[PDB]
Design a protein around this ligand. Structure first.
Ligand SMILES: *[C@@H]1O[C@H](CO)[C@@H](O)[C@H](O)[C@H]1NC(C)=O
Ligand SMILES: *[C@@H]1O[C@H](CO)[C@@H](O)[C@H](O)[C@H]1NC(C)=O
Ligand SMILES: *[C@@H]1O[C@H](CO)[C@@H](O)[C@H](O)[C@H]1NC(C)=O
Ligand SMILES: *[C@@H]1O[C@H](CO)[C@@H](O)[C@H](O)[C@H]1NC(C)=O
Ligand SMILES: *[C@@H]1O[C@H](CO)[C@@H](O)[C@H](O)[C@H]1NC(C)=O
Lengths: 194, 596
């Protein structure tokens, strides 16, 4: 009854971080250490748990959030962080128990001349609360003068393209991120280790 | 809501947008500079156009935030860099014409060939062919042939281009609200918003001249000692009272006198302080040269080179497979991409140059976290100085002994120290009148002080007067000898190499004091000193976030350029030269010519 982690981790296309995707996982057996050695992940940090310990835990659901960011920014996918990604795109709660997993995706997501399809939100009037998701596109009013879904002075389209060229430094290269949240409700624990 | 916070958000936008457009312009230029082709000229033009158009729109917006209401010095500095429109103030036709001029000049410079009278189809480029002659030849006529062919066959091509370049560049500069292109270039040293740390564009000329007055006696005596030695190197060819012939100075121009060391060495029987022969026997190659520079920086606590540096740099000549601009350049392309472009040879010259160019990369890496507009040396002289501070330690006999290029039983005399100081002077002191004179000529051209029919007439008068060097062939206003040098035909400011040379000793004093150094400054090697690494890095990481005058004072305790640390470094050689010259002519007459 193995869990379909492959669908998430080995997906061909990844969401932009402003529009991060969530897959619900249930009714299956998950081997988290088999997933740990499933590749070389540049980041594999579990916060309320340990991987080898997860294989003797059971949860009612697991949620897998996936998106792309640059290397510099993987540090923002952790509780208590701030910055453009954590404030405006994807916010983990302070009491997070779950795993953050990341790997370098330069060979999939960068393109000679630049791949620009991955976006992030540059401006927002306040910070996202944990797991919130903003896909709106109104023009950000940075000034007195009220704009009008028209870019202009003090008025900025709020989303920006990453630009991934294979020649970028490793900080600037694309990284694919999978966040796993482990949920336990008063209901049958349907996702178990072996 | 406030202007300073509106400007903060605007810069936020600008920095993110700018970084990719700059980077795409850098890649296109890299392609042209490693692979000269017309297809790559047009891509460099297209990416340069795209970047300049974006810069024009963005600077128009930046100029709407009054700087009078900006407290954050770093917000004010970023907006200050966007106060002029830039290159885009030229019409489409003039901008296209200016680009065509720059690309023809740069292509002519590193692909132009001269061919032999003796051989109709041998063909030599400046690099390696003519440079090898101008560095190794001891034959008056061979050296004269390379020096004159280069200027006659390539310099004449550049003369009409250079005339129109002056016109268009000045037009650009007047629209950017400068007097002329030279005034524009001196703007790199301007500092405006900071009380007691300001520096006007006019102050730079006076500081260069006032400080150059203090360098003259040392140069006069190096000049006289070299001229006496050249008399036996070139019997019949050297006047005892005249300028030195321009083609006998060790490179295509006399920019450095380094390659005169073999002819002027004070104590020729001591172990060789030039480690060229030693690295050839040890089978060194370009890779070991750049790996050794890397290990030197790691010794003071600075990072390794990145993986992309080692993967994407061009560290040797690719062949005739493709045409490169061989002139050593340190590239900060953006987005963590750092490269050096260099056609390295197994010489001590290129060993030291590898250390200096990597120092510039070290600088680029240290301020990469700075916001885009402040990712720059505190001024062009700082950026040109860092690598040279390093090579001052990398050149010391003690350092060369410790990397195995001197015998493990090499012992230092007063004689070996005079040898080292003499070779150091041939490079460092020899270049100062060269550098001041070249740039004053350009400043005078730019401000309209030299009629076109007297360009080369004034050029050679100033060589004779300031530099004590004389052309071996009379030269027409069909020539354009300044443009036969890389920096003139590739549109680079040159006074950076003057201010840098004074800075590098000011800095070296402070780094060696941090390393708790024992004795005179020329024996100091900051290797393995992470204290010295730390003081250097803390200045490097600032970029242009602080005015250079405050930045300099934080390291060395002075707000201005100062000649005293350079003169003190060379003092033991200065005392020696004065005694050596006691039976020789010192000074030069400008009337003698090799030709008559
Ligand atoms: C991704 O694909 C590889 C290659 O088939 C496979 O070995 C690996 O287990 C897959 N990853 C996951 C999480 O299923
Ligand atoms: C040089 O440029 C041409 C096009 O300008 C390109 O097709 C060629 O592959 C390049 N050569 C190298 C060695 O990269
Ligand atoms: C404004 O200046 C302060 C220090 O004076 C600095 O910490 C801050 O980062 C600056 N503003 C921004 C947006 O960086
Ligand atoms: C260039 O910037 C200046 C501000 O100094 C501005 O007045 C001018 O409009 C800009 N160029 C254009 C597009 O006219
Ligand atoms: C210190 O530097 C010397 C050469 O200057 C070198 O031989 C030695 O290995 C270095 N020592 C350490 C601990 O790095």
């Amino acid at each position: 009854n193995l869990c379909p982690f492959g669908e998430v981790f080995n997906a061909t296309r990844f969401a932009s971080v402003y529009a991060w995707n969530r897959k619900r996982i249930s009714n299956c057996v998950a081997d988290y250490s088999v997933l740990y050695n499933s590749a070389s992940f540049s980041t594999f940090k579990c916060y309320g748990v340990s991987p080898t310990k997860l294989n003797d835990l059971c949860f009612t659901n697991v949620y897998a959030d996936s998106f792309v960011i640059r290397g510099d920014e993987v540090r923002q996918i952790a509780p208590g962080q701030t910055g453009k990604i954590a404030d405006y795109n994807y916010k983990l709660p302070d009491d997070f128990t779950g795993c953050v997993i990341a790997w370098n995706s330069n060979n999939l997501d960068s393109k000679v001349g630049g791949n620009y399809n991955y976006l992030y939100r540059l401006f927002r009037k306040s910070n996202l609360k944990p797991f919130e998701r903003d896909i709106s596109t109104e023009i950000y009013q940075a000034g007195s003068t009220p704009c009008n879904g028209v870019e202009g002075f003090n008025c900025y389209f709020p989303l920006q393209s990453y630009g991934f060229q294979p020649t970028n430094g490793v900080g600037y290269q694309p990284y694919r991120v999978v966040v796993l949240s482990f949920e336990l409700l008063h209901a049958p624990a349907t996702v178990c280790g072996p | 809501s406030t202007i300073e916070e509106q400007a903060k958000w605007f810069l936020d936008k600008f920095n993110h947008e700018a970084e990719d457009l700059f980077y795409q312009s850098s890649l296109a230029s890299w392609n042209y500079n490693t692979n000269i082709t017309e297809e790559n000229v047009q891509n460099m033009n297209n990416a340069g156009d795209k970047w300049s158009a974006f810069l024009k729109e963005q600077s128009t917006l930046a100029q709407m935030y009054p700087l009078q209401e900006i407290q954050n010095l770093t917000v004010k500095l970023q907006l200050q860099a966007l106060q002029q429109n830039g290159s885009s103030v030229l019409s489409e036709d003039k901008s296209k014409r200016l680009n065509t001029i720059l690309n023809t000049m740069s292509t002519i410079y590193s692909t132009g060939k001269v061919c032999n009278p003796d051989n109709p189809q041998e063909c030599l480029l400046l690099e390696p062919g003519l440079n090898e002659i101008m560095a190794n030849s001891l034959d008056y006529n061979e050296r004269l042939w390379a020096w004159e062919s280069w200027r006659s066959e390539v310099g004449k091509q550049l003369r009409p281009l250079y005339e129109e370049y002056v016109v268009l560049k000045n037009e650009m500069a007047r629209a950017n609200h400068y007097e002329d292109y030279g005034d524009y270039w001196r703007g790199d040293y301007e500092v405006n918003g900071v009380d007691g740390y300001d520096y006007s564009r006019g102050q730079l000329i006076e500081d260069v001249e006032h400080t150059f007055e203090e360098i003259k006696p040392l140069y006069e005596h190096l000049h006289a000692y070299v001229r006496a030695k050249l008399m036996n190197a070139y019997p019949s060819y050297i006047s005892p009272i005249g300028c030195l012939p321009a083609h006998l100075l060790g490179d295509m121009w006399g920019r450095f006198w380094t390659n005169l060391y073999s002819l002027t060495v004070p104590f020729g029987q001591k172990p060789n302080i030039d480690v060229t022969d030693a690295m050839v026997d040890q089978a060194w190659d370009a890779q070991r040269i750049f790996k050794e520079a890397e290990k030197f920086f790691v010794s003071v606590g600075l990072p390794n080179m990145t993986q992309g540096f080692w993967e994407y740099s061009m560290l040797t000549d690719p062949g005739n497979v493709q045409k490169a601009v061989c002139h050593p350049t340190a590239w900060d392309l953006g987005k963590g991409d750092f490269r050096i472009l260099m056609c390295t040879k197994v010489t001590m010259d290129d060993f030291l140059t590898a250390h200096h160019e990597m120092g510039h990369i070290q600088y680029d890496m240290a301020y990469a976290a700075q916001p885009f507009l402040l990712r720059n040396g505190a001024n062009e002289g700082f950026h040109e100085a860092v690598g040279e501070i390093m090579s001052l330690s990398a050149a010391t006999p003690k350092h060369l002994k410790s990397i195995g290029l001197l015998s493990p039983d090499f012992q230092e005399d007063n004689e070996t120290e005079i040898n080292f100081l003499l070779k150091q002077a041939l490079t460092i002191v020899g270049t100062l009148p060269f550098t001041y004179m070249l740039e004053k000529w350009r400043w005078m051209v730019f401000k309209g002080e030299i009629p076109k029919d007297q360009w080369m007439k004034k050029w050679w008068e100033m060589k004779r007067e300031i530099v004590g060097v004389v052309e071996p062939v009379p030269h027409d206003e069909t020539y354009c000898d300044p443009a036969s040098l890389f920096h003139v035909s590739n549109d680079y400011s040159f006074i950076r190499y003057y201010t840098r040379t004074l800075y590098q000793f000011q800095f070296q004093e402070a780094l060696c004091q941090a390393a708790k150094h024992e004795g005179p400054l020329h024996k100091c090697d900051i290797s393995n000193s992470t204290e010295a690494g730390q003081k250097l890095f803390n200045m490097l990481r600032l970029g242009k976030s602080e005015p250079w005058t405050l930045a300099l004072e934080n390291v060395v305790g002075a707000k201005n350029m100062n000649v005293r640390p350079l003169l003190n470094y060379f003092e033991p050689l200065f005392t020696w030269l004065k005694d050596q010259n006691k039976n020789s002519f010192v000074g030069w007459s400008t009337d003698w010519s090799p030709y008559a």
